[PDB]
C-alpha cells in the first residue's frame, strides 16, 4: 500500500503520475496519485483514507490540524541554498522604487496576494494591516473590510461574486479569472509577484525569494524594494531587517493517526535524492511545467526535513512570529 499523494489539481496530479514514473524507472519507492480539486478536498480525502500526503502551506497547516480531521505535519520543506539552508521564509511587501507610501499608506492601493488563506499572501499582511482596516469583527468576513480597503486585488481564491474587488486585478480569463490555481497567471509567489512586475499592483505580498529567482536579468531587481514594518523602504536584499513575519516553511502533513509516516518519509527522502535540486535532468520534484505553480512543492525548493513525532500544527506553527 504505496504512499498515495493527494495533488490539488489536473496539472499537479499530472505531475504526479510523472514522478511515479520516474520512481518506477529508477527502481524507487512507489507513490500513487489522487486527484482532487482544492487543499480542503486533500485534508478530507486523507482524514478518510482516501489518500495519504499533501503538501501545505501555514495557513492550510493550521486547517488540517482542525477536527475533524487532525492531520499533523511530518515533513518540512527546505528553502535556502545547500550551503545556506533553512525551514523557514519570510512575508515580504514587494514595491516598485520610486514610490514614497510606506506599510501604513496602503488605504485606496492595489494588491496582488498569492492567495486567500496563505501565509505570506494573505494571513500576515492582512493580520498586520488590522489596525489600518474598519472590520467589525466577525460575522462581517474579513474579505469586505479588506475589499473596501484596497480599491482593487487579486486575491486568488477569493470569492469573485462576494468580493469583485479582490479578484479584479486577476488575470485569469473566463472562469480561471481569480482561480486559486496555476489558470490564474498571478496565482501563488510567482503570479503575485507578476501581478506588479506588470504594473497591475502596487504592492505583491510574497516572500523573500521571488524577486532573486524571478528576474533573469539582475540588474532589474534595482526597480524593486521591500516595505519595512517600521514604515521605511529598503532593498529587497535587506528582508532580514525588512519583513512581515518570519514563517516556517510549507510541509507535508499525513493522518495523526495510522497516517504512513515512516513510508511517506521514505518516499520523500529517496525523490529527493533521485530527482531534487540538479538530480535528473529527467524530472525535478521541486521544478513545474511552464506557467505552472509550485505543483505538489514548492518550485526551487531543495530538499525536506524531517519533522519529530508528536508535534502537531499548532506546534509546527508556533516557530512563525509577526513584526506588526
Ligand atoms: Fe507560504
Request: with cysteine; aromatic share 10%; glycine share 8%.
Amino acid at each position: 500500500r504505496s504512499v498515495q499523494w493527494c495533488a490539488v489539481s489536473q496539472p499537479e496530479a499530472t505531475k504526479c503520475f510523472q514522478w511515479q514514473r520516474n520512481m518506477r524507472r529508477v527502481r524507487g519507492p512507489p507513490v500513487s496519485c489522487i486527484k482532487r480539486d482544492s487543499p480542503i478536498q486533500c485534508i478530507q480525502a486523507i482524514a478518510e483514507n482516501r489518500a495519504d500526503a499533501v503538501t501545505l502551506d501555514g495557513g492550510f497547516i493550521y486547517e488540517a490540524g482542525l477536527a475533524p480531521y487532525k492531520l499533523r505535519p511530518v515533513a518540512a520543506e527546505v528553502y535556502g541554498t545547500e550551503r545556506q539552508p533553512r525551514t523557514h521564509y519570510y512575508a515580504v511587501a514587494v514595491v516598485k522604487k520610486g514610490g514614497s507610501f510606506q506599510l501604513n499608506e496602503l488605504q485606496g492601493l492595489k494588491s496582488c496576494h498569492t492567495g486567500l488563506r496563505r501565509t505570506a499572501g494573505w494571513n500576515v499582511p492582512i493580520g498586520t494591516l488590522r489596525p489600518f482596516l474598519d472590520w467589525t469583527g466577525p460575522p462581517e468576513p474579513i474579505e469586505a473590510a479588506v475589499a473596501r480597503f484596497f480599491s482593487a486585488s487579486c486575491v486568488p481564491g477569493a470569492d469573485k461574486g462576494q468580493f469583485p474587488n479582490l479578484c479584479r486585478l486577476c488575470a485569469g480569463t473566463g472562469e480561471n479569472k481569480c482561480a486559486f490555481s496555476s489558470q490564474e497567471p498571478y496565482f501563488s509567489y510567482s503570479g503575485a509577484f507578476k501581478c506588479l512586475r506588470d504594473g497591475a499592483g502596487d504592492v505583491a505580498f510574497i516572500k523573500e525569494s521571488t524577486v532573486f529567482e524571478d528576474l533573469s536579468d539582475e540588474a532589474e531587481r534595482d526597480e524593486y524594494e521591500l516595505l519595512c514594518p517600521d514604515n521605511t523602504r529598503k532593498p529587497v536584499d535587506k528582508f532580514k531587517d525588512c519583513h512581515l513575519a518570519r514563517v516556517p516553511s510549507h510541509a507535508v502533513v499525513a493522518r495523526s493517526v495510522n497516517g504512513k509516516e515512516d513510508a511517506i518519509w521514505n518516499l520523500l527522502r529517496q525523490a529527493q535524492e533521485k530527482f531534487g535540486k540538479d538530480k535528473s535532468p529527467k524530472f525535478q520534484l521541486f521544478g513545474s511545467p511552464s506557467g505552472q505553480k509550485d505543483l505538489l512543492f514548492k518550485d526551487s525548493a531543495i530538499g525536506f526535513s524531517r519533522v519529530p513525532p508528536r508535534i502537531d500544527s499548532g506546534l509546527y506553527l508556533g516557530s512563525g512570529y509577526f513584526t506588526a
